Amino acid sequence: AKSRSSRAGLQFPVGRVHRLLRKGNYAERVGAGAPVYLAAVLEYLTAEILELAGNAARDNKKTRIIPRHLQLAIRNDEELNKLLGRVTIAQGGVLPNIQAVLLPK
């Protein structure tokens, strides 16, 4: 009747998260609120990254998030950068930056 996602006010699949937690060998007993909490954290991070990438792609006259702007957002946000430090986004490119020493004048 009521999905736990809508019950908690979340969009992510609390039920799928609970299933994955109890089937991933993480523990022998998954708390009632553990999957809700995990889904909430995942939704928060996803909303952050999606908003940043959206307004990074819309800053380039586009209307569709692409890997380039996803990478731009992930590398411009100091928190998301520390989070996904050793991660590489395919087709993301690099940040435009030329060292002053290499630059002329």
């Binding site: 590489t88 690099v94 940040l95 435009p96 930056n97 290499l102 002329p104």
Partner: protein
């Protein structure tokens, strides 16, 4: 005739390739190299089309980071130009050596 001074076209190439998002290594040569390397690990192993692309993406990202650290080490020595010693120091600090 007309030719640019040394340092004008390099900056243009940098500004271009730093915004362009496309594999710089040649696809078929990289695939042949991957097959060569896998031959010394197991004979007659097949590779999915996406596996070679993923390997190329990862290798290009690794080399881009390595060249960034190499340029940093080169500038540390008051040298605008990079050289194998810069890659050596970059890897040494990274912990790969």
């Amino acid at each position: 005739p007309h030719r640019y001074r040394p340092g004008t076209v390099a900056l243009r190439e940098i500004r271009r390739y730093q915004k362009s998002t496309e594999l710089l290594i040649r696809k078929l040569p990289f695939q042949r190299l991957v097959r060569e390397i896998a031959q010394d690990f197991k004979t007659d192993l097949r590779f999915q089309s996406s596996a070679v692309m993923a390997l190329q993406e990862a290798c290009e990202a690794y080399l881009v980071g390595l060249f960034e650290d190499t340029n940093l080490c080169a500038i540390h020595a008051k040298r605008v130009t990079i050289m194998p010693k810069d890659i050596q120091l970059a890897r040494r600090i990274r912990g790969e050596r």
